[PDB]
Design a protein around this nucleic acid. Structure first.
Lengths: 199, 148, 213, 265
RNA sequence: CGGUCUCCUCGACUAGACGUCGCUUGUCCACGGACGAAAUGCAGCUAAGGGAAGUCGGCAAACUGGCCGUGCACCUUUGGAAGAUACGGUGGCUCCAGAGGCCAUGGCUCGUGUGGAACUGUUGCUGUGCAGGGGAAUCUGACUGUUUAAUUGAAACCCA
RNA sequence: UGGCCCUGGCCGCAGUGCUGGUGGAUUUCGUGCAUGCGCAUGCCCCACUUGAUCGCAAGAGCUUCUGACCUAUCAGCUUGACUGUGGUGUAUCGGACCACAGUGGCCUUGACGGGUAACGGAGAAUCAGGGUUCGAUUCCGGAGAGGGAGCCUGAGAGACGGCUACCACUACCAAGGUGGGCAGCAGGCACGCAAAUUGCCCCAUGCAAAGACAGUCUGUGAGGCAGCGACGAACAGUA
RNA sequence: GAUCUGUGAAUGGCUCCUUACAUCAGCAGUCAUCUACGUGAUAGAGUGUGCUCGGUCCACCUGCAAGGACCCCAUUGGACAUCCACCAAAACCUUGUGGCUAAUACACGUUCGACCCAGUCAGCCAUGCAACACUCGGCAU
């Protein structure tokens, strides 16, 4: 079947290699998952692997755990759409989820979370506890606090569409986890989106 | 030169989180401008280039600023040519002793070796390169020292 | 055409022969496993309903349910499936075997039927005789299920026996089964031993870690 | 079709078992137990070939499955259990008590010992790790774990474990001056105190040992075995030659004298 | 229905002064009409199965046909042979790349000129007109050119 | 450390329970022992076994460096070809595969091609020395199971005394259907200058299994022993 | 005996067709990996929010900040085998059906196997500068 060996791949010189064995199972490959972004249901097929272990082909994922690195938050956030891919636009067009692809995610969590945690409302909406007031103002007065101008401009629209990058390998663990872009990577990919919106 | 990369992706270093609120001074280097950089000191009697420690380039397959571990043979060759990107051809002219005729032959072996952007080198300079995991079809060695 | 007709309520099975085409040809779209009336192929079977559960054909091939054709189809078949046999297929192999579809036709030599509804009069082979069940329930919970027992009195008294009379050279044997899933005070002490030793080992390891700290 | 091989030919058998090349095509392939297959004695070899209770393979199986051959303070019924170096083998019905050691020629001898010598064992630390829940452990050459060692017990040290409890009773450092035994290479079975350790980062360090009399040899640091804080306190009983290898002319003269004085009667 | 000098010469498809259709201009004039309109004929087409068995002779007709990509043998005067032979594709739609210019890296103009991909269709697309069948030899004239207006175009004449 | 939200919604992050297991033994009171005087405290079966984790061991896969025969009547070879970035896939690294970039990579120190009186090595025969020739064959490694290819099961197979298909031959048939795989051991036909018994047995050596032996026959054409055997060796007789 | 289940049949035996840095030999790496049997250790899952929330029984008001009564623990379920019976086929190491009956098969289930601590939520106390910020309460800044 799909073999990931190099007995067919010619020598580094350019000389042909004469194969004198047939394909061993320990060097097989399996067809790509090509995880599609699908609004709704998740599909995950378990795959029996070299030691009887499991891999998890994600077919048709919908969302996943997305982390706010500076904030240590990690909410499950319902991927909206694949916006950018590093090299080929065919995966962006057909909405294929692969690691290191850039996606718009819901982000109404990390907003309700930001409120619950800091007591800070990021958009004008469109009992009260003494200990909660105390703790929210403490977490406000901590040192590294402050929401950056590229993240709050996103969390301040009434329909949040925050830019995350997918970190898991969905065809291997069946997950579309990722991290929200922060700072210079956010600026990079926002600039790419600008370029292809204008050109 | 080869610090340049593609502009299709945002090349970051693996073990450095660029958006840390209160980062530590563990990777603040003693000659940098506050720029944090993960690096290691491969430890077979080699020195981590100041270019690697204080540089800005991003390189996986670099033995000093990436997860690539130097283990196995460590050979010495000459840079034949540098016509690939971050890869370089290295030659080892050695002498193989024929037993019957009690003499030697001139033989050679080429190697597609991986030069990190931490090394200044001209064509013809000597190189010590150590073995790493396979980085490509023919590349399985990284350049650990350039000798003028 | 031979019909293996089985009455489960009596627990018996009996074969019959029919060669009247006027009766046979009503069974030409009767897909497998669907009830039909006995009045269609016999007049002394009225009010009876036969579920056509299985079938063979000429040349002897089975009638695989769910194929939805009336000819032969060769198929990859795992063991134990209708058409292949589990004890012939080497612990995980599938064999390509020949089998007929579930649609009935005039290529069917044998039809396995089972009565679901009984009729007015009584069939001389099937329903005139009832066949007793060989064995009683062997596991404690099934014995309780049978004899309306609650867990305060035992099943060891209510276990059904099998009396074989004193045949040649041998006295009367009262054979009973070893009750399975039965909990004895011995079993309780065994499980308590296991659990207590496990907990003592956990305590050993906690004490070791605390002493190291 | 290939998986793990189950057989060991008699020719491909470890030479330190004096397997006769004509007495069968196969040799009992050791199981994957505590010791390495080329540094171990199968219990069948200890029971049939050395201590000839078992006249053959069948009687070896019998003796062993009757659950009275005890190896390291517990019964081992596998006829192919790889009993290795410094293991204690007791046969209570016979009152036999051996520690399996190396003779100066590099073969496994069964050195007869006494009570305290059988009630503990001596095992070298080869790896030092941490398991989940922050559990520092030290893997030894008998493959055992010792899930909570003293913090100041670095790698190449040796340990005295009590075969009853299976915990650590003592340990001996690998610093220069310790009494030491060789367990592989040409110099295996020789005892000599540590003199100096040449470092070779990235490769094998070398250990220079001074024999009991005055000879000097060298070997590898993963080839040495600590037995004793010094040549005055060996942590275990030691065989007849006490680890002092003779020259080959000395050995030939010794054999000749033995044969002659035996024929004298 | 032959021949006869020159000038101007639109739009669409297209490489186009080919070929097909249309605005401007001009014209419906050629002896007509009925009857589905025999046989025969002169023209246009088809034809199962076979495939030159027809015939002096594959005559006549048919096959092929544009473009793009890959590629191409013997022989050779080294120029050719060659479009050798041969293989694949070709629509529609939605996109992705891709070249330039002007005003002042934004406004505007901006590849009917190319490559890729997705979808799509009863596999079909140079969809019509148009549009090489190919290969292997012998004789012969080197070639190109010339020729008996009105039965011979040739191996004849001429040429270098 | 974070990966539930404001009453439904969303997740459902898949998994891990020393078995809802088995045998033998047997006295299971919570206070029996005792202390201090029943009150308070330490104890009140042994093994086997399904499974999870971490090592080790035993293996495997991949990878490193150096080292192979003749041939120029083979001088240029290569276009996933060589590197890179981002992914995919895998048990894992990797152009192994893909998308986008670049134009590399090897070569008279013989590349690429062709040949096989090519499986490789340990080794064998000679050998003053230096060397020459061979190595199908017992040990190790590789490959294969009629030619190909694809798989399932499983820890492990691209398995063939497993399956599936095509090809080449082929066996049975009641003509609808069913099959085949000796380069395992014997044996047969061919082919040839050219090579053995359709034997007995697990006694030894080992291996496997739910398995010491016996009551009560584990299997083993591995392996052993015999038969045939002027291959080839050693020792004797024919006085 | 049989049968289901487990486990083995991937080892061994044969052959040398292929194969020219390929195989292989020695050396080395896995800090790029997999692992049944073997062995040494290990193992505390009522657990998506502090609670409501393991299951029932009451409360209050778009829930609460201190509120309760019991129950779980003598251990689950449904099959299909061997078996009986009727059998299709010329056969086939081909095969159907009906009725029982097992589990270390399969499914399913898990309180007492913890305790404490961190953490999360809420409340309260003692004491202190201060009229600055953001607000709950009243009005169209």
């Amino acid at each position: 079947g799909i073999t990931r060996w190099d007995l067919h791949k010619k020598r580094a010189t350019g000389g042909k290699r004469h194969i004198h064995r047939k394909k061993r199972k320990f060097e097989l490959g399996r067809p790509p998952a090509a995880t599609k972004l699908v609004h709704g249901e998740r599909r995950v097929r378990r795959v029996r692997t070299r030691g009887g272990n499991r891999k998890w082909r994600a077919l048709r994922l919908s969302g996943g755990i997305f982390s706010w690195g500076s904030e240590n938050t990690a909410k499950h956030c319902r991927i909206l759409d694949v916006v950018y891919n590093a090299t080929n636009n065919e995966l962006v067009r057909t909405k294929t989820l692969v690691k290191g692809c850039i996606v718009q995610i819901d982000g109404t969590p990390f907003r309700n979370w930001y409120y619950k945690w800091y007591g800070i409302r990021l958009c004008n909406p469109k009992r009260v506890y003494k200990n909660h007031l105390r703790k929210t103002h403490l977490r406000r007065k901590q040192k590294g606090f402050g929401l950056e101008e590229g993240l709050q401009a996103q969390l301040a629209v009434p329909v949040c569409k925050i830019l995350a990058r997918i970190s898991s390998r969905p065809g291997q663990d069946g997950r579309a986890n990722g991290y929200i872009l922060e700072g210079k990577e956010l600026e990079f990919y926002q600039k790419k989106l600008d370029k292809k919106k204008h050109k | 030169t080869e610090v340049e990369l593609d502009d299709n992706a945002f090349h970051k270093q693996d073990n450095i989180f660029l958006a840390a609120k209160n980062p530590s001074s563990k990777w603040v280097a003693p000659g940098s401008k506050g720029r944090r950089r993960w690096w290691k000191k491969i430890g077979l009697g080699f020195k981590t280039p100041k270019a690697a420690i204080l540089g800005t380039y991003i390189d996986h397959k670099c033995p000093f600023t990436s997860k690539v571990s130097i283990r196995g043979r460590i050979l010495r060759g000459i840079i034949i040519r540098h016509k690939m990107f971050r890869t370089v051809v290295v030659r080892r002219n050695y002498l193989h002793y024929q037993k019957k005729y009690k003499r030697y032959e001139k033989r050679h072996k080429n190697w597609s070796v991986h030069i990190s952007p931490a090394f200044d080198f001209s064509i013809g300079d000597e190189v010590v390169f150590g073995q790493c995991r396979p980085l490509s079809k023919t590349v399985t060695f990284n350049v650990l020292q350039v000798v003028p | 055409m031979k019909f293996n007709i089985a009455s489960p309520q009596c627990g018996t099975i009996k074969q019959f022969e029919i060669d009247d085409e006027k009766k046979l040809v009503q069974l030409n779209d009767k897909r497998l496993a669907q009830e039909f009336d006995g009045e269609i192929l016999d007049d002394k079977w009225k009010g009876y309903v036969f579920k056509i559960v299985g079938g063979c054909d000429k040349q002897g091939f089975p009638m695989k349910q769910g194929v939805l054709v009336n000819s032969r189809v060769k198929l990859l078949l795992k063991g134990g499936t209708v058409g292949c046999r589990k004890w012939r297929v080497r612990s995980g192999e599938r064999r390509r075997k020949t089998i007929r579809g579930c649609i009935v036709s005039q290529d069917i030599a044998l039809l396995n039927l089972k009565i679901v509804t009984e009729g007015e009069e009584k069939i001389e082979g099937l329903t005139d005789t009832t066949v007793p069940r060989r064995l009683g329930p062997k596991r404690a919970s099934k014995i309780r299920r049978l004899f309306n027992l609650t867990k305060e009195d035992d099943v060891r008294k209510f276990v059904i026996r099998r009396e074989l009379p004193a045949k040649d050279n041998k006295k009367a044997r009262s054979k009973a089964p070893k009750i399975q899933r039965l909990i004895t005070p011995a079993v309780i002490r065994r499980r308590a031993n296991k659990k207590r030793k496990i907990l003592k080992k956990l305590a050993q390891s906690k004490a070791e870690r605390e002493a190291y700290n | 079709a290939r998986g793990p091989k189950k057989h060991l030919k008699r020719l491909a058998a470890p030479k330190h078992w004096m397997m006769d090349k004509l007495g069968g095509i196969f040799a009992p392939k050791p199981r994957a137990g505590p010791h390495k297959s080329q540094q171990c004695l199968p219990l069948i070899l200890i029971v049939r070939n050395r201590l000839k209770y078992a006249l053959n393979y069948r009687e070896a199986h019998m003796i062993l499955k009757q659950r009275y051959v005890k190896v390291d303070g517990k019964v081992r019924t596998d006829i192919k259990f790889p009993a290795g170096f410094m293991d204690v083998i007791e046969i209570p019905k016979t009152g036999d008590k051996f520690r399996v050691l190396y003779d100066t020629k590099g073969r496994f001898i069964l050195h007869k010992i006494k009570g305290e010598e059988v009630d503990f064992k001596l095992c070298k630390v080869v790896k030092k790790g941490t398991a989940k829940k922050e559990t520092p452990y030290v893997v030894t050459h008998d493959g055992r774990t010792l899930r909570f060692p003293d913090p100041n017990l670095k790698k190449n040290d040796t340990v005295v474990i009590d075969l009853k409890t299976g915990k650590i009773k003592e340990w001996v450092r690998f610093k220069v001056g310790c009494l030491l035994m060789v367990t592989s290479g040409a110099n295996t079975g020789r005892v000599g105190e540590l003199v100096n350790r040449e470092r070779h980062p990235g490769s094998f360090d070398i250990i220079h040992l001074k024999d009991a009399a005055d000879n000097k040899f060298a070997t590898r640091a993963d080839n040495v075995f600590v037995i004793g804080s010094s040549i005055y306190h060996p942590l275990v009983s030691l065989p007849k030659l006490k680890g002092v290898k003779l020259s080959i002319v000395e050995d030939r003269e010794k054999k000749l004298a033995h044969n002659s004085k035996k024929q004298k009667q």
